[PDB]
Design a protein around this ligand. Structure first.
Ligand SMILES: NNC(=O)c1cn2ccc3ccccc3c2n1
Ligand SMILES: [Mn+2]
Ligand code: NA
Length: 262
Protein backbone atom coordinates (compact mmCIF):
# COMPACT_ATOMS: atom_id res chain seq x y z
CA UNK A 1 0.00 0.00 0.00
CA UNK A 2 0.94 3.69 0.10
CA UNK A 3 2.70 4.86 3.25
CA UNK A 4 1.76 7.98 5.19
CA UNK A 5 5.00 9.25 6.72
CA UNK A 6 5.01 10.16 10.41
CA UNK A 7 6.00 13.64 11.66
CA UNK A 8 9.38 12.19 12.62
CA UNK A 9 9.79 10.42 9.28
CA UNK A 10 8.84 13.60 7.46
CA UNK A 11 11.48 15.54 9.39
CA UNK A 12 14.07 13.02 8.22
CA UNK A 13 12.85 13.50 4.65
CA UNK A 14 13.33 17.25 5.10
CA UNK A 15 16.96 16.64 6.01
CA UNK A 16 17.55 14.23 3.11
CA UNK A 17 15.73 16.53 0.69
CA UNK A 18 17.78 19.54 1.74
CA UNK A 19 21.02 17.61 1.27
CA UNK A 20 20.00 16.51 -2.23
CA UNK A 21 19.11 20.10 -3.13
CA UNK A 22 22.40 21.37 -1.74
CA UNK A 23 24.38 19.02 -3.96
CA UNK A 24 22.82 20.79 -6.93
CA UNK A 25 23.52 24.22 -5.46
CA UNK A 26 27.10 23.14 -4.77
CA UNK A 27 27.86 21.80 -8.24
CA UNK A 28 26.46 24.74 -10.22
CA UNK A 29 29.77 26.69 -10.38
CA UNK A 30 31.52 23.65 -11.85
CA UNK A 31 29.05 23.25 -14.72
CA UNK A 32 30.91 25.18 -17.40
CA UNK A 33 32.36 24.55 -20.87
CA UNK A 34 35.33 22.19 -20.74
CA UNK A 35 34.55 20.12 -17.64
CA UNK A 36 33.93 16.38 -17.96
CA UNK A 37 30.79 14.72 -16.62
CA UNK A 38 33.14 12.29 -14.92
CA UNK A 39 34.75 14.96 -12.78
CA UNK A 40 31.36 16.47 -11.97
CA UNK A 41 30.36 13.06 -10.61
CA UNK A 42 33.47 12.82 -8.43
CA UNK A 43 32.84 16.28 -7.02
CA UNK A 44 29.25 15.42 -6.15
CA UNK A 45 30.26 12.14 -4.54
CA UNK A 46 33.04 13.67 -2.42
CA UNK A 47 30.62 16.35 -1.23
CA UNK A 48 27.92 13.84 -0.29
CA UNK A 49 30.20 11.42 1.57
CA UNK A 50 32.81 13.71 3.13
CA UNK A 51 30.74 16.86 3.72
CA UNK A 52 27.08 15.85 4.09
CA UNK A 53 28.05 12.56 5.73
CA UNK A 54 25.38 10.91 3.59
CA UNK A 55 25.46 8.43 0.72
CA UNK A 56 24.49 8.46 -2.94
CA UNK A 57 21.40 6.31 -3.29
CA UNK A 58 22.11 5.93 -6.99
CA UNK A 59 25.64 4.61 -6.74
CA UNK A 60 25.13 0.89 -7.26
CA UNK A 61 21.34 1.08 -7.45
CA UNK A 62 20.35 -1.94 -9.49
CA UNK A 63 23.99 -1.93 -10.51
CA UNK A 64 24.26 1.73 -11.54
CA UNK A 65 28.01 2.60 -11.79
CA UNK A 66 28.06 6.27 -10.74
CA UNK A 67 26.93 8.55 -7.90
CA UNK A 68 24.75 10.88 -9.98
CA UNK A 69 23.19 10.75 -13.44
CA UNK A 70 24.32 13.42 -15.88
CA UNK A 71 22.34 13.71 -19.10
CA UNK A 72 23.30 16.08 -21.93
CA UNK A 73 21.11 17.44 -24.77
CA UNK A 74 19.46 14.48 -26.53
CA UNK A 75 20.14 12.13 -23.60
CA UNK A 76 16.85 11.75 -21.73
CA UNK A 77 17.96 10.23 -18.43
CA UNK A 78 20.43 7.98 -16.62
CA UNK A 79 23.41 9.44 -18.46
CA UNK A 80 26.60 7.88 -17.14
CA UNK A 81 29.28 10.33 -15.95
CA UNK A 82 32.36 9.81 -18.12
CA UNK A 83 35.85 11.27 -17.82
CA UNK A 84 35.91 11.68 -21.61
CA UNK A 85 32.60 13.51 -22.07
CA UNK A 86 33.14 17.27 -21.99
CA UNK A 87 30.48 19.94 -21.63
CA UNK A 88 30.45 22.50 -24.42
CA UNK A 89 28.91 25.87 -25.21
CA UNK A 90 25.15 25.69 -25.68
CA UNK A 91 24.66 22.32 -23.97
CA UNK A 92 21.70 21.73 -21.65
CA UNK A 93 22.58 19.31 -18.87
CA UNK A 94 20.56 17.55 -16.20
CA UNK A 95 22.21 16.40 -13.00
CA UNK A 96 20.03 13.92 -11.16
CA UNK A 97 20.90 13.53 -7.47
CA UNK A 98 19.56 11.08 -4.91
CA UNK A 99 20.95 10.97 -1.38
CA UNK A 100 20.21 8.72 1.57
CA UNK A 101 20.57 10.18 5.05
CA UNK A 102 19.46 8.52 8.27
CA UNK A 103 17.60 5.93 6.22
CA UNK A 104 15.59 8.36 4.08
CA UNK A 105 15.87 9.47 0.44
CA UNK A 106 16.01 12.95 -1.08
CA UNK A 107 15.49 12.92 -4.86
CA UNK A 108 15.91 15.93 -7.15
CA UNK A 109 17.32 17.18 -10.44
CA UNK A 110 17.59 20.35 -12.49
CA UNK A 111 18.78 21.63 -15.84
CA UNK A 112 21.92 23.74 -16.28
CA UNK A 113 22.63 25.68 -19.47
CA UNK A 114 26.30 25.65 -20.46
CA UNK A 115 28.08 28.72 -21.78
CA UNK A 116 25.97 30.74 -24.20
CA UNK A 117 22.38 29.44 -24.02
CA UNK A 118 20.44 28.82 -27.20
CA UNK A 119 16.94 30.27 -27.24
CA UNK A 120 15.43 26.84 -27.80
CA UNK A 121 17.42 25.16 -25.06
CA UNK A 122 16.38 27.94 -22.69
CA UNK A 123 12.76 27.50 -23.79
CA UNK A 124 12.65 23.72 -23.32
CA UNK A 125 14.20 24.01 -19.85
CA UNK A 126 11.94 26.88 -18.83
CA UNK A 127 8.78 25.08 -19.97
CA UNK A 128 9.86 21.81 -18.39
CA UNK A 129 10.39 23.48 -15.02
CA UNK A 130 7.07 25.27 -15.45
CA UNK A 131 5.32 21.95 -16.01
CA UNK A 132 6.80 20.71 -12.74
CA UNK A 133 5.72 23.91 -10.97
CA UNK A 134 2.20 23.78 -12.39
CA UNK A 135 1.90 20.19 -11.10
CA UNK A 136 3.21 21.12 -7.65
CA UNK A 137 0.63 23.91 -7.43
CA UNK A 138 -2.10 21.27 -7.86
CA UNK A 139 -0.94 18.97 -5.06
CA UNK A 140 -3.34 18.65 -2.14
CA UNK A 141 -5.52 15.99 -0.45
CA UNK A 142 -8.41 14.74 -2.57
CA UNK A 143 -6.81 15.37 -5.95
CA UNK A 144 -6.12 12.38 -8.20
CA UNK A 145 -2.65 11.88 -9.68
CA UNK A 146 -4.34 11.28 -13.02
CA UNK A 147 -5.40 14.93 -12.98
CA UNK A 148 -1.86 16.13 -12.35
CA UNK A 149 -0.44 13.91 -15.07
CA UNK A 150 -3.09 15.17 -17.48
CA UNK A 151 -2.29 18.81 -16.69
CA UNK A 152 1.46 18.36 -17.22
CA UNK A 153 0.89 16.68 -20.58
CA UNK A 154 -1.62 19.28 -21.72
CA UNK A 155 0.76 22.13 -20.87
CA UNK A 156 3.81 20.49 -22.42
CA UNK A 157 2.11 19.54 -25.69
CA UNK A 158 0.63 23.02 -26.08
CA UNK A 159 4.27 24.05 -26.49
CA UNK A 160 4.86 21.54 -29.26
CA UNK A 161 6.88 19.31 -26.94
CA UNK A 162 6.23 15.73 -25.83
CA UNK A 163 6.25 13.81 -22.55
CA UNK A 164 8.39 10.72 -22.09
CA UNK A 165 6.19 7.78 -21.12
CA UNK A 166 8.70 5.17 -19.93
CA UNK A 167 9.71 7.07 -16.81
CA UNK A 168 7.68 8.52 -13.98
CA UNK A 169 7.70 10.14 -10.57
CA UNK A 170 7.42 7.85 -7.57
CA UNK A 171 6.66 7.45 -3.91
CA UNK A 172 9.77 7.83 -1.79
CA UNK A 173 11.00 7.28 1.76
CA UNK A 174 13.14 4.50 3.22
CA UNK A 175 12.86 3.09 -0.28
CA UNK A 176 14.19 4.84 -3.40
CA UNK A 177 11.20 4.02 -5.61
CA UNK A 178 8.06 3.27 -3.58
CA UNK A 179 4.38 3.32 -4.51
CA UNK A 180 2.68 5.20 -6.08
CA UNK A 181 3.80 5.77 -9.65
CA UNK A 182 3.43 9.40 -10.69
CA UNK A 183 2.84 9.55 -14.43
CA UNK A 184 3.37 12.86 -16.19
CA UNK A 185 0.63 12.19 -18.72
CA UNK A 186 -3.00 11.09 -18.75
CA UNK A 187 -3.42 7.34 -18.30
CA UNK A 188 -6.63 5.37 -17.89
CA UNK A 189 -4.77 3.17 -15.43
CA UNK A 190 -4.00 6.00 -13.00
CA UNK A 191 -6.28 6.23 -9.96
CA UNK A 192 -4.59 7.58 -6.85
CA UNK A 193 -6.23 10.11 -4.55
CA UNK A 194 -3.68 12.10 -2.56
CA UNK A 195 -3.67 11.97 1.24
CA UNK A 196 -1.70 14.04 3.79
CA UNK A 197 1.65 12.48 4.68
CA UNK A 198 2.30 10.94 1.28
CA UNK A 199 5.80 11.64 0.00
CA UNK A 200 6.63 11.32 -3.68
CA UNK A 201 8.47 12.95 -6.58
CA UNK A 202 7.28 14.76 -9.70
CA UNK A 203 9.95 14.68 -12.41
CA UNK A 204 8.64 15.28 -15.95
CA UNK A 205 10.95 14.35 -18.83
CA UNK A 206 10.10 16.51 -21.84
CA UNK A 207 11.37 16.12 -25.42
CA UNK A 208 11.57 18.94 -27.96
CA UNK A 209 10.69 16.37 -30.63
CA UNK A 210 8.85 13.04 -30.47
CA UNK A 211 8.23 11.05 -27.28
CA UNK A 212 9.92 7.84 -28.45
CA UNK A 213 13.21 6.94 -26.75
CA UNK A 214 16.18 4.61 -27.28
CA UNK A 215 18.45 2.91 -24.76
CA UNK A 216 22.14 2.65 -25.61
CA UNK A 217 24.27 -0.48 -25.46
CA UNK A 218 25.79 0.39 -22.10
CA UNK A 219 22.51 -0.69 -20.55
CA UNK A 220 21.81 2.71 -18.99
CA UNK A 221 21.94 5.75 -21.24
CA UNK A 222 18.61 6.74 -22.78
CA UNK A 223 18.23 9.11 -25.73
CA UNK A 224 15.36 10.51 -27.75
CA UNK A 225 14.77 8.33 -30.81
CA UNK A 226 14.80 11.34 -33.14
CA UNK A 227 17.76 12.77 -31.23
CA UNK A 228 15.87 15.94 -30.25
CA UNK A 229 16.68 17.81 -27.03
CA UNK A 230 15.19 16.49 -23.77
CA UNK A 231 14.89 18.23 -20.39
CA UNK A 232 13.89 17.28 -16.84
CA UNK A 233 13.36 18.91 -13.44
CA UNK A 234 12.47 17.07 -10.22
CA UNK A 235 11.40 17.78 -6.64
CA UNK A 236 10.55 15.53 -3.69
CA UNK A 237 7.43 16.63 -1.83
CA UNK A 238 5.19 15.76 1.09
CA UNK A 239 1.43 16.28 0.85
CA UNK A 240 0.20 18.53 3.66
CA UNK A 241 -3.30 18.99 5.09
CA UNK A 242 -4.27 21.32 2.23
CA UNK A 243 -1.34 21.53 -0.16
CA UNK A 244 2.25 20.36 -0.07
CA UNK A 245 5.79 21.14 1.02
CA UNK A 246 8.75 20.96 -1.36
CA UNK A 247 11.55 19.16 0.47
CA UNK A 248 14.21 19.70 -2.20
CA UNK A 249 13.75 23.45 -2.81
CA UNK A 250 16.82 25.44 -3.96
CA UNK A 251 17.81 29.10 -3.81
CA UNK A 252 17.21 29.40 -7.57
CA UNK A 253 13.72 27.88 -7.42
CA UNK A 254 11.06 30.46 -8.27
CA UNK A 255 8.33 28.75 -6.26
CA UNK A 256 7.66 28.73 -2.48
CA UNK A 257 8.67 25.83 -0.24
CA UNK A 258 5.20 25.70 1.29
CA UNK A 259 2.26 25.73 -1.13
CA UNK A 260 -0.98 26.13 0.81
CA UNK A 261 -4.47 26.25 -0.65
CA UNK A 262 -6.24 27.63 2.42
N1 LIG B 1 15.86 11.28 -9.55
N2 LIG B 1 15.73 10.35 -10.53
C1 LIG B 1 15.36 9.09 -10.28
O1 LIG B 1 14.26 8.78 -9.83
C2 LIG B 1 16.38 8.01 -10.62
C3 LIG B 1 17.70 8.20 -10.71
N3 LIG B 1 18.24 7.03 -11.01
C4 LIG B 1 19.57 6.62 -11.22
C5 LIG B 1 19.84 5.29 -11.52
C6 LIG B 1 18.81 4.37 -11.61
C7 LIG B 1 19.09 3.04 -11.91
C8 LIG B 1 18.06 2.11 -12.00
C9 LIG B 1 16.74 2.51 -11.79
C10 LIG B 1 16.46 3.84 -11.50
C11 LIG B 1 17.49 4.77 -11.41
C12 LIG B 1 17.21 6.10 -11.10
N4 LIG B 1 16.07 6.74 -10.86
MN1 LIG C 1 13.12 10.28 -8.86
NA1 NA D 1 18.69 15.87 -22.19
Amino acid sequence: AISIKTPEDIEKMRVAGRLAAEVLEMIEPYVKPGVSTGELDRICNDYIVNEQHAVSACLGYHGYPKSVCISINEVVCHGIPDDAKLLKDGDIVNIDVTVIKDGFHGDTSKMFIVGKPTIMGERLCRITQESLYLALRMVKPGINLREIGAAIQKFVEAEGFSVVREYCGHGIGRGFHEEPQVLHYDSRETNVVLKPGMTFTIEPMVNAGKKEIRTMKDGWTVKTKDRSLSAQYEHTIVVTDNGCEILTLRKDDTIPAIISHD
